[PDB]
Design a protein around this nucleic acid. Sequence first.
DNA 1: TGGGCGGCGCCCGAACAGGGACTG
DNA 2: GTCCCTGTTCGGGCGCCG
Lengths: 406, 557
Amino acid sequence: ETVPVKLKPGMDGPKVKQWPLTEEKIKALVEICTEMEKEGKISKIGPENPYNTPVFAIKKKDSTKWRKLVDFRELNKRTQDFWEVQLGIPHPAGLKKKKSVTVLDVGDAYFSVPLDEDFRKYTAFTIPSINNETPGIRYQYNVLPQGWKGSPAIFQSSMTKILEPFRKQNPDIVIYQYMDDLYVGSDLEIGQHRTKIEELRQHLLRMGYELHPDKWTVQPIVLPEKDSWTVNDIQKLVGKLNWASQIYPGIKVRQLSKLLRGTKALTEVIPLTEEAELELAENREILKEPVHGVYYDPSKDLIAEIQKQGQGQWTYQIYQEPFKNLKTGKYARMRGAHTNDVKQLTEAVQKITTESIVIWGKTPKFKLPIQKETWETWWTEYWQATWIPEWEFVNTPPLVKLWYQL
Amino acid sequence: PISPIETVPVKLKPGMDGPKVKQWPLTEEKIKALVEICTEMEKEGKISKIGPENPYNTPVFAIKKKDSTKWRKLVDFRELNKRTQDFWEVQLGIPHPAGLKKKKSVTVLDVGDAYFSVPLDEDFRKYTAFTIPSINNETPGIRYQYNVLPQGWKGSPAIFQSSMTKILEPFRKQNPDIVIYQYMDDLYVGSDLEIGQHRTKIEELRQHLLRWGLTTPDKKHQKEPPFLWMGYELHPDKWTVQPIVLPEKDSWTVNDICKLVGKLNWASQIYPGIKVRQLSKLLRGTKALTEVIPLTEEAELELAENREILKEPVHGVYYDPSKDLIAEIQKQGQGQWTYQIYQEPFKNLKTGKYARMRGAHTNDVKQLTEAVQKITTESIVIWGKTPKFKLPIQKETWETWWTEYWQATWIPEWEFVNTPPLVKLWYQLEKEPIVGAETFYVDGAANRETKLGKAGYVTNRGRQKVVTLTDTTNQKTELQAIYLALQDSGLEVNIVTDSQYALGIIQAQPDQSESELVNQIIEQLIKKEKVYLAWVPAHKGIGGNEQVDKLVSAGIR
DNA sequence: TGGGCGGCGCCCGAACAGGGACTG
DNA sequence: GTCCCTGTTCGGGCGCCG
Ligand SMILES: Nc1ccn([C@@H]2CC[C@H](COP(=O)(O)OP(=O)(O)OP(=O)(O)O)O2)c(=O)n1
Ligand SMILES: [Mg+2]
Ligand SMILES: [Mg+2]
């Protein structure tokens, strides 16, 4: 029996145009959809359904198997009372503290559960064609779609019945469901952890990605160490400490600022006085302390900001309010000589989102340092998760890049 | 006849009711044409007579048709359209001849009375009610309603396209080696079959369309090249655009410039080098379609060049999927770019232009990146593949720009082409302060109420300078201060500013700007040999910043 | 007189949104 | 708060197809 699903009051369905697809993704989608239609998972619809959600396809790593990926971000925003409140799943604070967390794709399960008939229209999508040989061919789901916030919500009771025996027997393993995946964490040794995972798979016969969140530390703000300081050096230092005091109000600057009195050449050398030396060491100390008054608000959304530091280096901050960071960090890569900023950026978005899902049960909204058209032209070439975060496109102010650099 | 296909269920929007609009007066000519059409349609069950039980009406009219002495019947369904439900449009783009592959055998068919062969939802027909008059005081009126898709209704194009697709589906499914380009009721049908076998398959297709109620009249059955299709002439090894005729007006009106630019944009797909920047400029301040605009001398030049371009014979070729796609880009002036896409050296599949101005201040590397991304998306649409690029930018220039630039940027596989004008950065900012170079601390202040301001500098060598400005702003006065320092310094200089605004513009290395002042700054920056720009927080008593700050403040209270 | 509909394209300008700097 | 500046979106001309 189906579960009646409503939309948020006052909101309509998604009307999002389909973006162009390469030939091989179109071929894969047409294969996948012929199979899905034959199995009853989807049905052809026409243009009197006014809703649309974009579709595309990704390939599993070292695989030849394509995967259909529906961008249900709008539909998810428009059902957010249903999946977040009415049939929500709680998030465990111990999951992030485990030695190992394995991610298991459990999405297939949803295709066994029928979707409410009144709601199927909202799941409409359109397959396009090379050179517009044909108008778009339209479908809608007849079963819980992968990628819809409603699917794990509705499937929650079955998943709990399925996991009750395994949880009972293995009571120190924590299992957290997020949208298409199970996150399975334990403090076992890697040999015995893996067998426990390839024990849960046998159970789930009614791949995997390995994570070590107990080793995720924070990236402190840090100040330059040098035995010779120029007027330029001290101007840079004072500017950075001035910005930092918006976060750590104990940052003091006047004893360094006093070294700069007058109109001097940028390259002239300036010995640090005892007063300024002690001020600088005290500032170094203050930066090591936790930021005061940062309390996670589970009602508000997460904001993730990213900066390109150059040479394969990226920095990022997760916050809900300005200057009150929940997390900071970096994403580093070897000097590739064939470096792809777009690919590195999507890899970074995925790592950050994975971390947020493990820590807060929430994906963040990304401020991305890239032109919209570049990102939209190429990001799906490198995407490998089933979820997709929200994002918007920003022109990072050069000073901000300078402040979080390492 | 009328297709036996299921109808598409169609609704009014919640709470709405059918249209009740009086009928216009019409020509004797249009009345006669409409009665001739409607008696035949009623005979064929495509429209049905209606009586006083239908409280709806919508005006009808008629227009001549393209290549005929025949009339198209239209209904001004704007009211019903506003009250009719939304549709999702399945026509996602316009097919392009350069995406066609060579075929041994080619046919073009035109479906007869296309809309009037697809039936309309039983429950929705009452709203399509119209009426033909005999004369304002002659007779009652014809007073029919539609049983099929009417021309004028917002729902008819999508419902027809979706119906045509459902009808073609089994035929495509059992004929994978035949390609059918389906744009609204015209069908391009290509195959590699010998002419005999191809004509048998064509007859199968036509019989199949007949079984679904769609005729293909022989008057519109094209069988020999050149085929007329989507605005082009398809020959066996090349395609051309049907001729583009530009106006030769003496006085020019805004509507005329719109028509001119529109024809130039259409021509730029095959004719290389079209530019419309100056013609487009002629539209900036306008406020009426009837306002006469005089051509600037620059617009005169641009239009003459486009004319000479259009006097040349040009053609495209078809796509060979076993060869690489190659896109080649050339810089023109003033934010304009041309490209050619080909697979063999002097045999274009198509051409194009990109001239969208983005940003107050930008440079040629940003613009070239935007052009590459546009060409990439257009190529994925037409051929489903990304092209290999030939670009007029040095690998080193691109390496430097992507290394120093703080936004993620990327360009797919490309090779350098050494035909000028080349794309360069025209100055670099130093990463470290310059030994020996004079250090200028600059600042500027502006009075919010009086608009007067001051800009100036202090240097480590004792030089001071302040200039007063009128009708200015804080941001303008900070740019003035930097400009002042660039003018007065030697070939190597360090500059300390407190304005994030000016720092942000200058670090992005613009080579063109909407602001005249930023253009002057750029000319100076290019003249320098080394420039180091530095930022300090304002109003903190720092360094020389404090001295300039005091100097440029006699308009801060 | 032309007058209706859907699709895609281009270019411009009006309406907003967001962030830095400033007032007393 | 106000003012300045910049970037995005969207409608409304026109072009082309049907
Ligand atoms: N200005 C126009 C042109 C066309 N359309 C629609 C879309 C295609 C369909 C063709 O009808 P249609 O009766 O077959 O007319 P055609 O000119 O193709 O003639 P044909 O029957 O082949 O002789 O009309 C429209 O709404 N507005
Ligand atoms: Mg026709
Ligand atoms: Mg200032």
